[PDB]
Amino acid sequence: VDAKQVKVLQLINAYRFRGHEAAELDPLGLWQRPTVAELDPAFHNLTEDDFEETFNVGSFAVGQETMPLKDIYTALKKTYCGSIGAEYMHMTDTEQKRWIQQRLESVVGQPSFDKDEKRTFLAELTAAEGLERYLGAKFPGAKRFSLEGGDAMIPMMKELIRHAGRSGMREVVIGMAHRGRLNMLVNVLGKKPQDLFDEFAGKHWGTGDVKYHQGFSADFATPGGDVHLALAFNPSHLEIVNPVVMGSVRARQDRLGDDDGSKVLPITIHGDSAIAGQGVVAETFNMSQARGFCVGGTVRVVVNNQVGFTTSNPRDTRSTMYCTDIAKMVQAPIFHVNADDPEAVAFVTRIALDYRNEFKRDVVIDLVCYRRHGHNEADEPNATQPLMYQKIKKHPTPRKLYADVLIDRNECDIETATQMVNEYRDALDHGEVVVKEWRPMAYLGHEWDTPWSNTYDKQRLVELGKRLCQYPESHTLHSRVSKLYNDRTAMTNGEKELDWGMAETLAYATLVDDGKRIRISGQDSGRGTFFHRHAVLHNQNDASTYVPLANIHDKQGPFEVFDSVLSEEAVLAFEYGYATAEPSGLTLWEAQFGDFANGAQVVIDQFISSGEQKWARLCGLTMLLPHGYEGQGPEHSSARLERYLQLCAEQNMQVVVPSTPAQVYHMIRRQVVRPMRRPLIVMSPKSLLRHPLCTSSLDDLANGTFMPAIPEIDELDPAKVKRVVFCSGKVYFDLLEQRRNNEQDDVAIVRIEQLYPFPMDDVKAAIAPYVNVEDFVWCQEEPQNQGAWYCSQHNFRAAIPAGTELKYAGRPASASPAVGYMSVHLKQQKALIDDALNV
Amino acid sequence: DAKQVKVLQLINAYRFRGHEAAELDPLGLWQRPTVAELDPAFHNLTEDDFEETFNVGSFAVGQETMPLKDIYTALKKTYCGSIGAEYMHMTDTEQKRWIQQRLESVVGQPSFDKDEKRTFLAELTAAEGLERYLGAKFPGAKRFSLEGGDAMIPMMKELIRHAGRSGMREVVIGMAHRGRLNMLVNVLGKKPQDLFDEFAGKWGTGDVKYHQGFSADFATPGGDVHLALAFNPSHLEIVNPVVMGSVRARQDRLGDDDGSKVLPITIHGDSAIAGQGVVAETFNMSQARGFCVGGTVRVVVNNQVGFTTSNPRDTRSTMYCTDIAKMVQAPIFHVNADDPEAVAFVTRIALDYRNEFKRDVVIDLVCYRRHGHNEADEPNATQPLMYQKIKKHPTPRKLYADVLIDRNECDIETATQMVNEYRDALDHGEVVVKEWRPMAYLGHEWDTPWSNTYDKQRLVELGKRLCQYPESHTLHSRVSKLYNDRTAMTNGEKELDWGMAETLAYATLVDDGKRIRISGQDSGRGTFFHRHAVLHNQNDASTYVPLANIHDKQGPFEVFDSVLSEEAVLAFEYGYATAEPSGLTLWEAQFGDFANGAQVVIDQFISSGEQKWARLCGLTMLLPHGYEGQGPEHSSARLERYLQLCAEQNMQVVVPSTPAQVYHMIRRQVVRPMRRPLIVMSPKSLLRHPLCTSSLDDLANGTFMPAIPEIDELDPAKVKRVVFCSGKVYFDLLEQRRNNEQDDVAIVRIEQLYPFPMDDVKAAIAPYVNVEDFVWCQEEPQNQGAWYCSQHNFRAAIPAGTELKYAGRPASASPAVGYMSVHLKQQKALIDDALNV
Ligand SMILES: Cc1ncc(C[n+]2csc(CCOP(=O)(O)OP(=O)(O)O)c2C)c(N)n1
Ligand SMILES: Cc1ncc(C[n+]2csc(CCOP(=O)(O)OP(=O)(O)O)c2C)c(N)n1
Ligand SMILES: [Ca+2]
Ligand SMILES: [Mg+2]
Ligand SMILES: [Mg+2]
């Protein structure tokens, strides 16, 4: 009934919502943060006399039901306006808001750490500073992307790993960028400092990568036992590694049966400028609770040194007060903490991990710090941030402030802190591992033409097909789906040749029949964009689903196909991380059309095509890219085959253009059964899914094999052949039908199904019979500046007899991939067919 | 008075969470989880309290005191009806009170005059009639029907009417396939007969009908307004940054400093806006200086399905697809699309909010998709219950007509007259937009002559002004050193470096009154410490920009340190350059290796917009490029990819090698009357190379050379081999040939690789009548660079008796090696191989 008691409650609520806006977060003290009137008691009409009266605390979780207002006011400022700026009241979940209030408000901001723990934090701050000054002394001017100014991340990361083992987690996977990367390698993951000193000195499998992109694996002793540690390889492109780490841990969580993600912990580290500006951050946040990509939530740490290279003005880097405001899209709590207060850092770190393990949701730690040097060690920061570095020049390091605090508290002494600095310098001189909790951990690279088991028992293959066509009798299907499954029933009885959708389905069935995993993701991949797959049967009565590939037999390998979020960059990065972590199974990503894969171009350029040469990473990821010129316009015709062929080199990737249902069946099986794990780029057909001539028999599947090149199929006279037409994909069936309708027999048509690595022997074998050949033609639907022409012509010339010429037949070069009009498309298609067939 | 505190907390609970119980789904399939805070029993309010009067606090219903039973009814009408208001997450108290006054005073029930209700019904009739008409006349054809979201047509026209009502001059729209033909015919005023011709089959290679843009004038109560609908590709959401660049280009030209004259509108799909990362990149630019346009009205056509995907657990991680907007604290108005008056009422609020606070605002139009994703697709295979409900769901026109008839605000004959009269207008084939009004070459070939010369005395006066700065504006000593060098360059005591000639090139354009807009990461100083367009005071943090201080009549100059984004920023500058081609619009990647993050803008806009949409764009892209031993991501701008994209004169690919060449190259992009994209391989070490210098006369009296002939005085008859090359590899070849005292080898630069300058190249090669072979030298791996794409051009230029040979790095999966020592060995090998006869 008291009115001021209600005013006290609104004062508490105002600090929970907005206390972070006045918190002393900047270590440099340069921030002049705008005043918030609600934090002032006078805003709530509380006077000096009210401060002496006792009040009930309401839901304020300080640990006593009643206390005087002067003590309530002191409690709020210490809880929410000290070194910790807690941002959590935007969340809608009441239980989670109560959970955070119990952690912070009972502590009243002041964490209690053991003298052993306080010494470990100081020793870890000593390791962070000492390694960085050591590298600056020994290699002056060399780029190292120093952690200095953000030294608290080293105790934070080791406290995160220790708390992860303390909570029974088995593995931790980390994605990070350049900032503090060498510090994380030496002082957390346990890389030998002498090995790091060798890399600065010029001592080095493949073409390699820069020192601050390297990953690492190690075991790490924790109170709860040894934990495996993994630090990802990444390119210079920022933030893209985050989805890749999400895929790796999900592949780990799948293998371990960790359905709630409590055994494998994902940690991503971000820069303040990068996390605000890169769109892949939002795409990954949008996948955090998708059933096909969720990993139980990620702990996300921003090393917020308040500058991006030469850009520090908030009006240039972002549109909001905090770089972490993107996290609000998924209502993640955000803990801003001053980096000069390591105990607040470790205290916020335990809370953020406990929140992640409790509610299985993303959580963000904003480590507000500074950059002691320029963006790199050879760059001048004063030219563009004069005031910031005039303050940094007179700012003591976090180790020195923390040691001074412990000494004034008589929780440490000056000689112990001095011993840490000098002893760590000697340990770097010794060159051995300086991580006391480090522990030792307790191929698939064969050439593409390695022999593999292509055959399958034909009766088992029919038995698998009969099981694929079965579904519960109460699970009513839509009539168009019942029709397609009836066609699939006729294919299993030999009454019809198999179409693309059936041969693709049997390929998955044989792999789960062998216990191999299959994970498919992509937009509308459950049904298929072109209505050909229908891996998921939707009941017409309720909305229940049934997946025949998940019901082959007990003890089968797992099968999953996910309708992916409407994203390409983060999703393709996720599946690359999944396939690299678990190469044994099939991992396939399907673009809706191949034209849209260029939105994930960074994953294609910096991971898929180059990860083996740069990091010795094998990845067997399969990419289905629908492709084909059928008159549907520039964005529904070309998967940009020319770009993938341009990326091919040093056996890095496979580029394949299957033309038969049997070819895609063996192609898929070869990607698992053959002991090689390199990316498989596939030009998926569209009209060929229903082309009457694009069919295969059960004998082609059971006893056939993937053909890198397909010889002439029609009854020709080898001596009468005047021209051989090379081609790939659906253009073959256009050439084949026109050549038959012309009753032509002086023209041979040979398909090159695998465009890279180039199958020279198979191509020469297909061309041997025509001893009277005069010229060779490469026919393609693509414009002359696209497709295989400019990139693969040298391979075609090396295969043909020396006396013959190679000629081009195809669409003219064009700036746009395809014409906007169907009528123009059909006339262009007929011209390239007639030109290829015209002796 | 304890219940009085409970009543205030009940009011606050509806402001925060009333949207979670609102009747938003037209189909009523949503079983929304119960919210305990909305229950009065949760606040310990019983039946006895409901009869007692209470003070409403800040509840803006128009009376300070009310019985609890009326307050409870008022809250449900305000926050749990057709409108789900999400605004309490905002921190700004003035903006929260502003929204509360709009919604709570109305108590949910907007008041429209009988004329306005008739306009909404007629516009719903136009939306439905055109879509059923196209289905009857072209069955099965892809049209991406608006049906189920018909309220967007009255919403857009009310947005434009309200925009002119508040004095705005221009509105620019970016949207996707959904309702695109409806927007063209029923809002932008495209002739229905012209649309019917395109369904029946018919400047360039063209594009599909639902990518077309349009321009028109639009009568509003406040006067005529210009309307623009953007061209866009199939790639979703990418058009949004492009529209942001167009409106900023309009606001810059008009002096619309606060963005109140030009209104940007973006339309989104529910699945696309949640999943595409360019959305967040654009929201992060909404208040950054150099990209802000005063806020955008953003409309989501939320039909609760994406193609075959409707399960929320597969499309997003949150209850709402619009939750991304919370990163910038935008209010979000969810509205049932079957309630057009709630739609129009929310529409006026969102525009009034945008004009008042100059911030982004989102309208979540909760609707359904009447047909499959396209008209030839079966939705029931994957969404059975949703379409079993849609099959028995009346259309929005029918529901609104019934409502007006039950209110006696309309009659069945008027609603029937609208349906049949609109069908007759489509048969007539003329414009059906009653407020439509009529509106009140940069493609010449690349070799067109242009004014390359400049007064040398004028150029020296420009350079001396560039070196001036206030004497109190203390500079960092390294910046004072570089500016002292530029002073000596203006006095003729030193040859020009890359940074000075680039700066003088900008100086001549603003000197002629042309605009210059530069954006890119760290572009003010330059990533490589060469530009320093912005001088930062060492005492305070104040800035000074010499290029903005040439003279009082100069054209505007701006260089912005861009956000850490490539996709949205390059899409923004493409929209800026296309909207205002007169000036220079330049985007600088930090390294060219990072431009692949904006590959969609490169593939679908820059390289193809002319052939597809007849749009000219003179955007310049500085992409730092060069093999200097810094690793795979700091060596290659992927020149081979840009050359692969070249065709039909679409783009210019240039690799300047001298400070004079970049000066003329820059000037040519404005002075020459052509506006096609300029792809530039920017140097890095050449910014400080002692041999990479030019004189003031090279700027004043020189010109851009597509090819540069041999510069050393050689005997033409002694040359046994010609080495073609581009970029910094030339300076490596030149020094090695000089150290060898070699004179049988000529080194010719091909500065412009596309369009290929055959005549300039052949002129450089004519003197060497005794040549035996030609070499293409490149630092790039053989599968990269110009080799595979440009070799046919090299063969066509050389005499028939000679062979073309390759000298360069071996093909590699990664652009460059990790180690500097391996890099120097590879560099020495390709240099020695190119020069070794
Ligand atoms: C996608 C991408 N664009 C540009 C760059 C170039 N780049 C490297 S670091 C950097 C600044 C990063 O700023 P911040 O996120 O604050 O990281 P910090 O160095 O300050 O720790 C930029 C623009 C890059 N590496 N990746
Ligand atoms: C970047 C990109 N990825 C994929 C596609 C293919 N695609 C076209 S429409 C579509 C579904 C769009 O869903 P939504 O955003 O809800 O739009 P709607 O059709 O429902 O109006 C997809 C995935 C595309 N056009 N662009
Ligand atoms: Ca992107
Ligand atoms: Mg930073
Ligand atoms: Mg949709």
TrEMBL record, chain A:
InterPro entries, A to Z: 2-oxogl_dehyd_N, 2oxoglutarate_DH_E1, DH_E1, KGD_C_sf, ODO-1/KGD_C, THDP-binding, Transketolase-like_Pyr-bd
Keyword Calcium: yes
GO CC annotations, alphabetized: cytosol; oxoglutarate dehydrogenase complex
Top class in the EC scheme: oxidoreductase
SUPFAM superfamilies: Thiamin diphosphate-binding fold (THDP-binding)
Residue ranges of every copy of the Transketolase-like pyrimidine-binding domain listed in the record: 498-691
EC annotation from Swiss-Prot or TrEMBL: 1.2.4.2
Keyword Oxidoreductase: yes
Biological process per Gene Ontology, one example term: tricarboxylic acid cycle
UniProt keywords, alphabetically: Calcium, Glycolysis, Metal-binding, Oxidoreductase, Thiamine pyrophosphate
Function recorded in the entry: E1 component of the 2-oxoglutarate dehydrogenase (OGDH) complex which catalyzes the decarboxylation of 2-oxoglutarate, the first step in the conversion of 2-oxoglutarate to succinyl-CoA and CO(2).
Protein name, UniProt field: 2-oxoglutarate dehydrogenase E1 component
Phylogenetic lineage: Bacteria, Pseudomonadati, Pseudomonadota, Gammaproteobacteria, Vibrionales
TrEMBL record, chain B:
Record-linked SMART domains: Transket_pyr (SM00861)
Matches recorded under SUPFAM superfamilies: Thiamin diphosphate-binding fold (THDP-binding)
Gene Ontology molecular function, alphabetical: metal ion binding; oxoglutarate dehydrogenase (succinyl-transferring) activity; thiamine pyrophosphate binding
Catalytic activity from the UniProt record: N(6)-[(R)-lipoyl]-L-lysyl-[protein] + 2-oxoglutarate + H(+) = N(6)-[(R)-S(8)-succinyldihydrolipoyl]-L-lysyl-[protein] + CO2
Binding, thiamine diphosphate: 177-178, 234, 236, 271-272, 303, 373, 594
Top-level EC class: oxidoreductase
Matching PANTHER family: 2-OXOADIPATE DEHYDROGENASE COMPLEX COMPONENT E1, 2-OXOGLUTARATE DEHYDROGENASE
Name used for this protein in its record: 2-oxoglutarate dehydrogenase E1 component
